[PDB]
């Protein structure tokens, strides 16, 4: 169906490990989109091809509005091709760099986002495992979407894929390589609260080997403006033991959350 010759291909979005990403338009309907390009041969080294495949499985499957759309898929001799909805705002990496901290009213409302578009996902006992900010994206009402579920699997699981870059967003039994579930995403929307208030993850350090202790032993504190609410939830989302991190309903009917987030379960 699709080929390359079906596109005009236009600025950078952004480059991933993998993906090189640009909007493009459709010629015949001028439908604009993000097309992510990936290198058969970068793939085929790094043995990823798996990867790649449960990226499109799930998001072409899933239809939610806070999670972003996979159209379909092409490939030539020496590239694979992605056609994905195109997040005109941005990522929520770039927003942060840019402000520097949240308030507690966007950080309220991106984590209601985040735990609602979760909870559609581990309805189908879908984890994600890899939500960090560079795979949050924003819609053109400023709206946040998931994205990147090359990581993904369905629960429980092991790891059988060797880890990338930073430590900071996985849980201990995640970096331990023991068997893990649907906890894993708790874990991980609790870095993000925190580092959302803060303007820099709780278990930062500078070095990968101290990173993964200071993940294994659950360390860290809090500055003086972090208030009495939003410290009970990150404190209660970081539980090293997976069954004491709360459920989704609990995160979004949480005091501090309905105090402060302008959107809606
Ligand atoms: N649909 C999109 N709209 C706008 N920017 C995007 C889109 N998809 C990806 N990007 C940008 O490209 C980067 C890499 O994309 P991603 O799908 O995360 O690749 P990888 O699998 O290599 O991490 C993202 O962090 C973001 O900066
Ligand atoms: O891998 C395939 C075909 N293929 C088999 N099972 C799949 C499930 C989902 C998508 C494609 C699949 N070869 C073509 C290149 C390619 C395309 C998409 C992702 C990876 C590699
Ligand atoms: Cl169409
Ligand atoms: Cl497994
Ligand atoms: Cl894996
Ligand atoms: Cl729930
Ligand atoms: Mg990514
Ligand atoms: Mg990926």
């Given at each position: ?13 952004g480059k991933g490990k993998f993906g ?123 709206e946040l979407k998931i994205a990147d ?21 996985l849980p201990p039994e995640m970096i ?90």
């Amino acid at each position: 169906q699709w080929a390359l010759e079906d596109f005009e291909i236009g600025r950078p979005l952004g480059k991933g490990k993998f993906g090189n990403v640009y909007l493009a338009r459709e010629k015949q309907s001028k439908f604009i989109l993000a097309l992510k390009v990936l290198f058969k041969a970068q793939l085929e080294k790094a043995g990823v091809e798996h990867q790649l495949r449960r990226e499109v499985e799930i998001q072409s499957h899933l239809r939610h509005p806070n999670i972003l759309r996979l159209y379909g898929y092409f490939h030539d001799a020496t590239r694979v091709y992605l056609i994905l909805e195109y997040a005109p705002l941005g990522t929520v990496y770039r927003e942060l760099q840019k402000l520097s901290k949240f308030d507690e009213q966007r950080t309220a409302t991106y984590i209601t986002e985040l735990a609602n578009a979760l909870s559609y996902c581990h309805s189908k006992r879908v984890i994600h495992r890899d939500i960090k900010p560079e795979n949050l994206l924003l819609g053109s009402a400023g709206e946040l979407k998931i994205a990147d579920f090359g990581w993904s699997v369905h629960a429980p699981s092991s790891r059988r894929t060797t880890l990338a870059g930073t430590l900071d967003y996985l849980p201990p039994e995640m970096i331990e390589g023991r068997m893990h579930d649907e906890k894993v995403d708790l874990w991980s929307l609790g870095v993000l609260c925190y580092e959302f208030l803060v303007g820099k993850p709780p278990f930062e350090a500078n070095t990968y080997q101290e990173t993964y202790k200071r993940i294994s032993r659950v360390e860290f504190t809090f500055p003086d403006f972090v208030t009495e609410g939003a410290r009970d939830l990150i404190s209660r989302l970081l539980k090293h033991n997976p069954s004491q991190r709360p459920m989704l309903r609990e995160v979004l009917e949480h005091p501090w959350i309905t105090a402060n987030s302008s959107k809606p379960s």
